[PDB]
Design a protein around this nucleic acid. Structure first.
Ligand SMILES: Nc1ccn([C@H]2C[C@H](O)[C@@H](COP(=O)(O)OP(=O)(O)OP(=O)(O)O)O2)c(=O)n1
Ligand SMILES: [Mg+2]
Ligand SMILES: [Mg+2]
Ligand SMILES: [Mg+2]
Length: 540
DNA sequence: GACCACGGCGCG
DNA sequence: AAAGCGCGCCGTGGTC
């Protein structure tokens, strides 16, 4: 019911837009509208009308900004009601839900989206009047970060497509050998990808023991953890786990990624979703480039396909022991602080215990394993689970958990203060005041309450680490531009950059310093930096 | 074609 | 699977 006005809109109007599909790098811009001052302006031809905007201001601003960047236009994102709602409550993840919560409807019409953006901005900006810590997060982190993310998304990353095509052919041959061996040991063929058929074979036909059951339907589970258990109670299991590895990698990375190269960039473009997680982390999708393989030799082969443009180098920067350092700061544990002031490495230390070798003997595959144990235990893994992953007696696992925490005695104190203030206020918060609402801290079913507790005390540590990385991205991005380097990926506590070969060294030193200095804590932040033609060689 | 739930699993 | 947390994507199996 807004007065139809002629295009263009006045400066500072709210934009609405419709995409043929959710990925801005692939979408056709179907319709473009703007709203301000009781007027809605609808664009005659959406692509041309992009040239008239000075900024993208409205719901999903970053997506329109990426599509503008793809078309050679600098149209930075500004205000986005989604960002306001997400700071108020990170359960606010989609326009559909935000619109109904704060007074409107997310439709499929640009003009209605424009009007909705204007109202939703007014209401939410008012709900934020007075929330000085959240306002600071919005102005100094989330709103400027969206500009960085738009540039990352539009830049993309070079992928060695030919290499991966070749790899698909080798991997397929190994899958068919493993499959043939599985069928032989079972005495007939069947779909190894059907967990239902595999369950029957393993537990009915071959009589193997069934260790555990699935959550929703109570089937006998065929998970890696259950199969690792009985990995000698039959050799078929050995093969199935290998088949699972290869097919996971082929179907998720090797085959799909080469078909996602963009015609106009020649590169691979992810999306960095800014209002997607309960803790303040980013997520990555279409495709997810935050879960590229790294653990196994085949995974590393896949990771080697992510390469630098000709004449450039990749620079990979990864915070050291990051959530332990954050925990040191948040809890104030004297022993934990000392650890890092002394340059100790808890992942290496735990790996030493796990595999029984001196710390100078811990290799990379060993240290990485220690990480799940270290964060497993910190965030509340059960002795039974630990016992089974480490392959030690139950009593040895309880003992490790007890020693872990008694090493750093103020941590349990910090957990209980976090939970207690979380029961009273209904949310928990990061160092910078980012909040997560956690009801159920007072639930009357113990299992439900204890799950809420593990959610609640993880969020301040994981979310503070997320705040620190976002703030560093915001500080680092202008310096990279001035140096002619590019930011490509964020993987929670890691940045991957692309830099001209002749500046790569200065870029690495500079990026390390900004990341280490982003916000001084009671413990040094240390960053490991590597340079290489490919993502794997850049982390060594 | 489009959904979706589930078990499962890659990374942080 | 189990008292780690946070994600997104796969294939299967099922429905419309
Ligand atoms: N299994 C894991 C792995 C990671 N993380 C969290 C805590 C880590 O600190 C953070 C970053 O992951 P990294 O793999 O980079 O681990 P670290 O930063 O702690 O160790 P490293 O010194 O190897 O970088 O993500 C987690 O909760 N559980
Ligand atoms: Mg790290
Ligand atoms: Mg990392
Ligand atoms: Mg699921």
């Amino acid at each position: 019911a807004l007065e139809e006005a002629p295009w263009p809109p006045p400066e500072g109007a709210f934009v609405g837009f419709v995409l043929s599909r959710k990925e801005p790098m692939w979408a056709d811009l179907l319709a473009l509208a703007a709203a301000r001052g009781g007027r809605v302006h609808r664009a005659p031809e959406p692509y041309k009308a992009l040239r008239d905007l000075k900024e993208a201001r409205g719901l999903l601003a970053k997506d329109l900004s990426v599509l503008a960047l793809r078309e050679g236009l600098g149209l930075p994102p500004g205000d986005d009601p989604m960002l306001l709602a997400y700071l108020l409550d990170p359960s606010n993840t989609t326009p559909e839900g935000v619109a109904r919560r704060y007074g409107g409807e997310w439709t499929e019409e640009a003009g209605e989206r424009a009007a909705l953006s204007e109202r939703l901005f007014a209401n939410l900006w008012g709900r934020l009047e007075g929330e000085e810590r959240l306002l600071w997060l919005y102005r100094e982190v989330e709103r400027p970060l969206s500009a960085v993310l738009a540039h990352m998304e539009a830049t993309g990353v070079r992928l060695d497509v030919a290499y991966l095509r070749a790899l698909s052919l080798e991997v397929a041959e190994e899958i068919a050998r493993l499959e043939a061996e599985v069928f032989r040991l079972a005495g007939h063929p069947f779909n190894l990808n059907s967990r239902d058929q595999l369950e029957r074979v393993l537990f009915d036909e071959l009589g193997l023991p069934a260790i555990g059951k699935t959550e929703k339907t109570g089937k006998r589970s065929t998970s890696a953890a259950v199969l690792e258990a009985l990995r000698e109670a039959h050799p078929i299991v050995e093969k199935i786990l290998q088949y699972r590895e290869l097919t996971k990698l082929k179907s998720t990375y090797i085959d799909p990624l080469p078909d996602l190269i963009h015609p106009r960039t020649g590169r691979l473009h992810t999306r960095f979703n800014q209002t997607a997680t309960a803790t303040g982390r980013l997520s990555s999708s279409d495709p997810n480039l935050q879960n590229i393989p790294v653990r196994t030799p085949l995974g590393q082969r896949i990771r080697r396909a992510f390469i630098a443009e000709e004449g450039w180098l990749l620079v990979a920067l990864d915070y050291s022991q990051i959530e332990l350092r954050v925990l040191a700061h948040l809890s104030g544990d004297e022993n934990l602080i000392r650890v890092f002031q002394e340059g100790r490495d808890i992942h290496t230390e735990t790996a030493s215990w796990m595999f029984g070798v001196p710390r100078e003997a811990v290799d990379p595959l060993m240290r990485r394993a220690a990480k799940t144990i270290n964060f497993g235990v910190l965030y509340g893994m059960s002795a039974h689970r630990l016992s089974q992953e480490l392959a030690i007696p139950y009593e040895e696992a309880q003992a490790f958990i007890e020693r872990y925490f008694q090493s750093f005695p103020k941590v349990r104190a910090w957990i209980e203060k976090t939970l207690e203030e979380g029961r009273r206020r209904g949310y928990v918060e990061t160092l910078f005041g980012r909040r997560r609402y956690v009801p159920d801290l007072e639930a009357r079913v113990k299992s439900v309450r204890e799950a809420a507790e593990r959610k609640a005390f993880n969020m301040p540590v994981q979310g503070t680490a997320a705040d620190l990385m976002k703030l560093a991205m915001v500080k680092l991005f202008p310096r990279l531009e001035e140096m002619g380097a590019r930011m490509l990926l964020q993987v929670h506590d890691e940045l991957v950059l692309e830099a001209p070969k002749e500046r790569a060294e200065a870029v690495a030193r500079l990026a390390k310093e900004v990341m280490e200095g982003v916000y001084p804590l009671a413990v040094p932040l240390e960053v490991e930096v590597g340079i290489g033609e490919d993502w794997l060689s850049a982390k060594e």
